[PDB]
Design goal:
Four copies of one chain form a homotetramer. Helix content of chain A is 48%, strand content 15%. In chain A, helix 1 crosses helix 8. In chain A, 55% of the residues are buried. Chain A starts with 13 loop residues before the first strand and ends in a 6-residue tail after the last strand. Chain A has 242 residues and is an alpha/beta fold. In chain A, strand 1, helix 1 and strand 2 form a beta-alpha-beta unit. Chains in contact: A-B, A-C, A-D, B-C, B-D, C-D. Chains A and B meet through helix 5, helix 8 and strand 7 of A and helix 5, helix 8 and strand 7 of B. The complex binds ligand O74 (2 copies). Chain A: Its EC number is 1.1.1.100. Chain A: InterPro entries: 3oxo_ACP_reduc, NAD(P)-bd_dom_sf, Sc_DH/Rdtase_CS, SDR, SDR_fam. Chain A: Pathway: Lipid metabolism; fatty acid biosynthesis. Chain A: Belongs to the short-chain dehydrogenases/reductases (SDR) family.
Amino acid sequence: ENLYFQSMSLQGKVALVTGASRGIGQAIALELGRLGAVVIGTATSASGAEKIAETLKANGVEGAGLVLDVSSDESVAATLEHIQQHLGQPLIVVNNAKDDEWFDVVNTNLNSLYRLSKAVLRGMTKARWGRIINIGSVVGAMGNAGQTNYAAAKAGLEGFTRALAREVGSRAITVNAVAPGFIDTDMTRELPEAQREALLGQIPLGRLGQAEEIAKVVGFLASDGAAYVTGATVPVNGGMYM
Amino acid sequence: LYFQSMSLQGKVALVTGASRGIGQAIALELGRLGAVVIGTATSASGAEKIAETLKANGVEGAGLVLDVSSDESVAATLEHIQQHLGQPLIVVNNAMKDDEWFDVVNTNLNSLYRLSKAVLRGMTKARWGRIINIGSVVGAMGNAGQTNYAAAKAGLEGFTRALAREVGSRAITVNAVAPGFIDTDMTRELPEAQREALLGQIPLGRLGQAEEIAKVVGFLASDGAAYVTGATVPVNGGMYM
Amino acid sequence: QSMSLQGKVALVTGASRGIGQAIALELGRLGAVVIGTATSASGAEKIAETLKANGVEGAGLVLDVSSDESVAATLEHIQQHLGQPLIVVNNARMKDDEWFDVVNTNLNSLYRLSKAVLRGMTKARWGRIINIGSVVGAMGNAGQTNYAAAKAGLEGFTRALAREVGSRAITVNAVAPGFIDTDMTRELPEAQREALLGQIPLGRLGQAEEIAKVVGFLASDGAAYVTGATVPVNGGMYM
Amino acid sequence: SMSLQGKVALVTGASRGIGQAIALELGRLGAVVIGTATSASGAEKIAETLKANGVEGAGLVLDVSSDESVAATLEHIQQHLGQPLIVVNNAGRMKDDEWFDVVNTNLNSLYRLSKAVLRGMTKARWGRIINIGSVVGAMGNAGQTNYAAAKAGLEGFTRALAREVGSRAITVNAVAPGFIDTDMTRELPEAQREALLGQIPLGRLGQAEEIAKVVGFLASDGAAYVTGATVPVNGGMYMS
Ligand SMILES: O=C1C=CC=C/C1=C1\N=C(Nc2ccccc2Cl)c2ccccc2N1
Ligand SMILES: O=C1C=CC=C/C1=C1\N=C(Nc2ccccc2Cl)c2ccccc2N1
């Protein structure tokens, strides 16, 4: 009786989810796991990679926790070479991660997205199928410098994603992004209460978003039903736009 | 567990302009996700076609006649639905010359507003709702057609954003879907040279299928899209204009 | 010298004070003959006085852009007494549901006035239509909804009309101000003023003259390849 | 008012087309103008062009990709001509996979030059930075991708830098041209030219001087409350 929904299944796909040790990234690893995919979650530290592997086992999800530093050509090549040998090619990839800091931050994020994306693309090109999904940063940054950073990264993410989607379309690989708003995370929990209350007041739905609410959007994008969606940045912010 | 977030079991959905193409594909998708579905058309023959189509696909619901330009037709059709089927908590609005753009947008948005306002009582009572507006398909011939398309798209997106702000506190979401070059009876009328030129501008290298719109709509209608509101989701294979 | 509006006639609606006034004077000073308008006869007197006092040939008239009759009438008067206006500048606690009627009314007004002045511009094969958006300041969430809706509608409207009239060398542009020093923004309570200022990188309110200078440029021959554009003048505060 | 009397302006990539038209416009508005090029011959051409138009200034060699060339060229300008408080960044087979490197390079170059001229502008508590985007380069899909990526990057960058430097009364804006007369557009056969013109509501290509006038206005005191903006100068053809 629930059988129509088997077409949203990711049975037989392998998915790589960076920064999967907590919050949004973790909720995504579990959602893709639950949809049937084999899931490799990653972290910068060995302890995070352990936490991921534990978390996956505990939720009945085949896969692994690995260490990955997207700023390193070496770590990227190595991690992918490992995944292909032990688990399969990842055809679903989810990238999750002062006044003057904005430029270096955007420059670093996008050089990282490009490095990882380019590496997983050889596999997706051979398969003539792929899903690349870039997760933007959460709203909350304190003060003007934080607004500048957030807005810059969001503009860069959206133009990048659009462009890469044009570059890889003919190979039936989609490239999309998700732009969260005020989501309940460790980072937003550390905002002082006055600023949390002020952000809520600007959200039409009147609540913070849940990590799972980002993950579901990601899960849909990864499905065969989202196949004509590419180059898009989907905002998940309860109606609060900048 | 994965489908508790996808199911529309026990929801009622109203889908305008459901007699063919995109609207039809959406009626069927919401049906298949478990909703009771009322599809509508401007003519009695279209309303028959809808009801036939629904029965043939194993979907409980109805085909009705609805003219979104008429306060009377709207009030009447809703009354009928509440009495016979339940309150529609999912509503999907689907439905030249140089100077026609302004009237076209004005008419589209007045129609969206009229229908949306009427279904909002029901949603407010339930503290739950999904409104979803479907934008036009790419294909329009010449410069006047481009002006019309680009205006309607900008209007749809601003409108959707504003209504979403207005109704958010009641856990009703309002989103839109902006299709690109989709295979419809209208795009099939395009001569081959123009189809080929449009394809050439689409990174995926193909026209979109009506079902491909409908899946996006099905997702927006789900509980998993609950924090998505005010958004216009483009479904265009990477061709942005 | 090069940015002169010598020999052009300009119509500037809502010109009796603030932004509209500053624009009337700026175009006047650039050499144009200027007709400023107001909803009231007293405003129209004030405009005509203000123009004389600054050495600007033109007139103050009464105009209600919501009325087909007031529009047709005011234009008929201007053509008969002063020339065809080839530069036209449209200037002119809320509840959660008011946005739609407000936008609908603003844009129906822009369309009405724009369509009417277009016959003149078409004859001349030259024109400048310039739409001024509303000033930032609106109180609460309903006001933000309204401001954002009007701004989106202004931009799309301006783009579309620009496509329609381009072949006749008429440009259509808009100016989207931010937090400008006006009578209306002066009456905002201090907490809201302080909060807005804190969000402006330049760290100050904008002056009416600063909007007017942008408008003056758009009206010039040097802005001839600028059309369909909405130019933001907000000290770096975007939303 | 509109005069740039007493200002010094640095204009990169000034040896021809848009950059040249801007050098001359700022010159004619009264500024002292330093135009720059990657080559010594271009720098000669600039200096010749300035003298011929009655504009005090100089032609220098500048490679915006080099920290050394940047530091050196600024040093030279400060010593001989004054601090440049108006800065206009213009500078510079097509494949669908080139967009990233192009944007990464343009923006690293803007950042490098902008950061260097900011000390001067901070000390003066006045400045104008103006970034010129790329005209459309090629009619393919790849030409669209590149064009749209550069433009998106330029806009976000300009917006961010404007937020960073606003308190010091420095404005940062960009100008996004559409189609100007180029070798590429000159070679379009009549049918394709008509179709390109047909996508431009004004029905013509834009002149370098038309970009330059916009720049001149942005540089003036009248544009003081305009910052973070990208002003499109494309005859009504919008593309992204
Ligand atoms: O007329 C338009 C051309 C381009 C883009 C938007 C509009 C437009 N927009 C309208 N509404 C609108 C536009 C943007 C945000 C919100 C709203 Cl309601 C509108 C409402 C009533 C009558 C005419 C209207 N026209
Ligand atoms: O690669 C891109 C494609 C489309 C739009 C923007 C980018 C992009 N954008 C970048 N930066 C950027 C984008 C928007 C706002 C601010 C910045 Cl820095 C960027 C910075 C360093 C290196 C590469 C970058 N690429």
